[PDB]
Design a protein around this ligand. Sequence first.
Ligand SMILES: O=C(O)CC[C@H](NCC(=O)[C@@H](O)[C@H](O)[C@H](O)CO)C(=O)O
Ligand SMILES: [Cl-]
Length: 493
Amino acid sequence: AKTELSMGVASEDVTTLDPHFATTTSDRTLVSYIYGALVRFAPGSANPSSIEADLAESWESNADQLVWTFKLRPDVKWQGGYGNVTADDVVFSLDKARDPKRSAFSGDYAAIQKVEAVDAKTVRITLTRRVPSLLALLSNFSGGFIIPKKAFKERGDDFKRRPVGFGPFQVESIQPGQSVTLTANAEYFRGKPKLSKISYRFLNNEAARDLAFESGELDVEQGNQDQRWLQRLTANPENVVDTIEPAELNLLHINITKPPFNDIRVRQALAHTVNAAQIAKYRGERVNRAVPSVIPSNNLGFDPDAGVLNYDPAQSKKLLAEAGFPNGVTVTMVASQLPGLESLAQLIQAQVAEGGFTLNLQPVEHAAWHQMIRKDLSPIVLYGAARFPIADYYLTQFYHSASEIGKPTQVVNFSHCNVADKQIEAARTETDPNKQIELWKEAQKLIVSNVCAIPLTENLGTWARKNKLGWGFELKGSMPSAPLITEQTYFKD
Ligand SMILES: O=C(O)CC[C@H](NCC(=O)[C@@H](O)[C@H](O)[C@H](O)CO)C(=O)O
Ligand SMILES: [Cl-]
């Protein structure tokens, strides 16, 4: 049968295939095909209850949950002839993942004191203090992916373009700004993939990607957040549409240190002229939902009563006049050209005019935009993301003062939020389910009332596949909100 898969994504190019840096949906998707981790989510699940053995066959923890020991499978081979995956590779990968100079995700691993290779198949992880879930940090997402020490040392700066994993697919070549050619890893420990090749194509323009999928040029295509796309794609019986967990939350992160937004009244005015319920209704309720807090709704610790500011543009105009702006405010936002973020920025632009805001949009290619926002080049950041569904992840990365832009510990705190540090830190080490949740809720209320970030809608991942393609499992979720392609993915006869 057919063994070559063609896939079209809303992206211009590959930025990095080093999993300690892969941040864009497209880079994270490619990284999920190439690498594995000590533990993994079950294929087709984005649910932490599915976390199971991957490179690590089994594990043990002590009673205080500070010392974790992992027993590695002995049969796991690296791609590109780097031999067996050893405890030394895990030590190197995790030491790199927890280093802010060699990883974008070091903050997640702050509690790790040391990572030791007890023997060639045994890894011991020692924590300084308790974490909500150590297994979460070691799963096949963000900094959890394992890389070879020897391959990274040899390739250095080229590793991001010539990745080496133990996953079911390997990168054969990159055609910059066009595609990534992946081939089956014949030595994959769970068995040889049914697919021989993946042609992963950069087709950012939605109308062009839709034409390529309709003609049969693509077997898989990324969709958008519009219910019209969903309806059109379902109408043709040769297609299957997938709405994938987790939902990515979009927020307007306001830099609270920059005038005019250093006055809480101006931030409140903006929050009162945004209409998240209207965005969800306009886009479609099956894929989109307004979120009554600053973290995604599927998070453990989510606050449905965080106190989100209501739609009242008459109050926005009154607050602006009180702040010394009787004829409104003009704001210039550096906006991503990822089509979903672009259309969302345009809906916000129309909405905020009601409350006296003239929002100007400076469009920039998605990956370049990712680095500009991380240099404080935008007064407001329209950012979309899902994290491991424990409140600590989203809260720390986006709203803890250590994560603010300009610090060596920076993550994605574009707002420069510093009002919930105590609550975030306290919740991390609290083991009681209810007490931990209360601290997370307190943090959400403080972030909302300070108007550090304005929540909009969260969106499930939307993809279309041809009938002939089988994922090899039921696809409910995948941590990057993009389909997972494994050794089980195949074309039907
Ligand atoms: O993980 C991250 O830090 C960022 C992931 C992020 N993923 C894209 C994303 O969230 C989009 O789906 C937007 O929510 C959507 O297009 C807005 O309508 C990105 O590539 O920007
Ligand atoms: Cl991208």
